[PDB]
Design an enzyme around this catalytic site. Sequence first.
Site, PDB file in Angstrom:
ATOM      1  N   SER A 266      18.920  57.293  24.631  1.00 22.59           N
ATOM      2  CA  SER A 266      19.461  57.752  23.355  1.00 22.59           C
ATOM      3  C   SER A 266      18.370  58.360  22.473  1.00 22.59           C
ATOM      4  CB  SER A 266      20.173  56.610  22.631  1.00 22.59           C
ATOM      5  OG  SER A 266      19.333  55.489  22.465  1.00 22.59           O
TER       6      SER A 266
ATOM      7  N   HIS B 107      24.317  52.771  25.653  1.00 21.12           N
ATOM      8  CA  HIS B 107      25.075  51.641  26.190  1.00 21.12           C
ATOM      9  C   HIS B 107      26.431  51.937  26.834  1.00 21.12           C
ATOM     10  CE1 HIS B 107      22.495  48.291  24.962  1.00 21.12           C
ATOM     11  NE2 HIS B 107      22.216  48.990  23.868  1.00 21.12           N
TER      12      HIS B 107
ATOM     13  N   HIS C 277      22.663  55.740  19.878  1.00 19.49           N
ATOM     14  CA  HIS C 277      22.172  54.714  20.798  1.00 19.49           C
ATOM     15  C   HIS C 277      23.330  53.950  21.446  1.00 19.49           C
ATOM     16  CE1 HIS C 277      19.797  51.569  22.602  1.00 19.49           C
ATOM     17  NE2 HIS C 277      20.428  50.643  21.903  1.00 19.49           N
TER      18      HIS C 277
ATOM     19  N   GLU D  49      17.443  47.724  28.011  1.00 20.38           N
ATOM     20  CA  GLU D  49      17.062  48.593  26.885  1.00 20.38           C
ATOM     21  C   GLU D  49      16.009  49.670  27.213  1.00 20.38           C
ATOM     22  OE1 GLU D  49      18.615  48.745  24.078  1.00 20.38           O
ATOM     23  OE2 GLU D  49      19.666  46.836  23.969  1.00 20.38           O
TER      24      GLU D  49
END
Lengths: 309, 309
Positions: B233, B174, B169, B214
């Site tokens: 992710s 990110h 993730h 997100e």
Amino acid sequence: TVPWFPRTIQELDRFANQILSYGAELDADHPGFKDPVYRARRKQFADIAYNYRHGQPIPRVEYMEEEKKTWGTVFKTLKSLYKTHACYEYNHIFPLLEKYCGFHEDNIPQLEDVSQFLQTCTGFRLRPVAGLLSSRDFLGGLAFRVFHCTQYIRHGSKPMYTPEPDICHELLGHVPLFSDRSFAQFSQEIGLASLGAPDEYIEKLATIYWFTVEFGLCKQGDSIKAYGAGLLSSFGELQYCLSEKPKLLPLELEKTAIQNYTVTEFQPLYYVAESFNDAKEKVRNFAATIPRPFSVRYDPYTQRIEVLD
Amino acid sequence: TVPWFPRTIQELDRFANQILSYGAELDADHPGFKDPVYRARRKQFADIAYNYRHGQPIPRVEYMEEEKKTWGTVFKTLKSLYKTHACYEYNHIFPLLEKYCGFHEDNIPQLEDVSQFLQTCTGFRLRPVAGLLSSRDFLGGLAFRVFHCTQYIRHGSKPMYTPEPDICHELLGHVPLFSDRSFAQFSQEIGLASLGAPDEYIEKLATIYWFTVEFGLCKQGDSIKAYGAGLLSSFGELQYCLSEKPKLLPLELEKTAIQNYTVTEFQPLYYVAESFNDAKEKVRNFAATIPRPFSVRYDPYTQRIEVLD
Ligand SMILES: C[C@H](O)[C@H](O)[C@H]1CNc2nc(N)[nH]c(=O)c2N1
Ligand SMILES: C[C@H](O)[C@H](O)[C@H]1CNc2nc(N)[nH]c(=O)c2N1
Ligand SMILES: N[C@@H](Cc1cccs1)C(=O)O
Ligand SMILES: N[C@@H](Cc1cccs1)C(=O)O
Ligand SMILES: [Fe+2]
Ligand SMILES: [Fe+2]
């Protein structure tokens, strides 16, 4: 055409080994150079600067007794003179260097420690160099908040003055103000304006820089103080600059810029700024007039120059 | 009264070890946690984050075959999905990570190398953490262009999705956008606005962040793409987010901010932004409305916050 200029902090290494001098090697008044033992010692500091590369920690050095003695004499004598000769801004910062940067008469500060300190103050860092750089390269470094600093010390036979930028000059003359937020921004600003500018403007900026940042005088209240790095590292010229010997004229860029100056003797003439702040503003305003077919923008997060227009 | 907030990058270590979770430990649907061998493995990564201190190089780790296998499955499946599911901005950057940051299916990138890379791109750096941080602490980190990143990887029994921010993730969701100049400035801006703000605004910012950074969706041209880190992710939720299963609504902060969301399952609802750029602008505009009895100014040269007013 625009001359080549660094666009990254790593690109500074390109000219790091291009050293010059004020041409005093053949001077009978500065026997220091001729000293064979002193020359070999100088060669050692030069090799360190030559092999040094961007980002690496500045190598620590063990100074000789003659060198430590010289620093001691220079430091102690200047500290006494600063009380009555240095400008307010300088005296307010100096105590901090002594307490948080190890500035003492019985210890020559290691550049690595000084550089780490400067970084915390204003983001400025040191980059060891073998000696004097061209005005273009020195100014170009300031754009990245990088101060090319020497590591060797002046010959012990004449601590009062030296026609070269030795460690005493770099640390006692320049470092203090580079730790000041406002002066640091000012310095980077002139450096940014010099990037890729024609040499006729670079040399003019250099002369202005000489009569201000290097040998400038300024009045604070009803007195006159020294703020030039070159005066603050020479206890010999620091005494002289406020004496009846030199000629003094008001700071006026138009006249100051075309004025001649010496590089191997005390200045016969100094320019007095209305104040330390007015000096910075005047120099700042002139640098902004430097013409070039583009504009520059520095990104502090990436440490890269952005060429616009 | 204003809650305490970091004013220096070193001050971030104060809350570095305050870890939380989405409360799935007792979930029978996520047997991963219960795994005793997996728990001991997790404990190892946690100790590294606990002993880690500001400025230090992020310790390198040797991953187990199960872990490398998991990264391989996750990486390969997502790379295939990105072609048709990820937004333009993401796909334009990903190739660079693969070529200059070692992003490959047969190799889990070491955070130290990823952090060095990010620093050159936008000045962002990684700070290893034991796990999930509070929204206030995470956002506060972004103000210094610091991304608190985990180092452990999701349990190998369910690579398609995990209710925790594991290394997949952090790196695939990110990191890519943190390497983008515009997104990086955007991220730091919201972080700066969150410093010392009342919790009712922090939680509201967190909900908005959740439905955009997100799990946000955005339309580019006549299609819909995913840009949310959480979608990028999870190959399981990435497939689902553009399927007929979830409910879709236009991004409208006033409604998005008071909307509920899940943290242990696929989102039942997503908000579609008019474009990736409009999403950033909307979130940016809201953060600027966060009230506080002062203003903040970040000095990138000193890496310190300046509290004004
Ligand atoms: C900019 C102006 O020429 C100034 O005198 C510069 C020149 N080059 C320099 N080079 C080094 N290494 N150190 C200095 O202090 C200076 N001073
Ligand atoms: C800001 C928002 O709460 C967001 O989901 C944050 C919370 N804490 C986090 N903590 C860590 N270590 N990593 C993350 O990716 C996040 N995401
Ligand atoms: N003359 C100064 C050194 C320098 C001034 C200007 C350039 S080098 C001193 O003795 O410290
Ligand atoms: N569910 C995501 C992880 C997270 C999304 C949001 C916070 S943690 C994934 O499987 O990668
Ligand atoms: Fe100088
Ligand atoms: Fe996340």
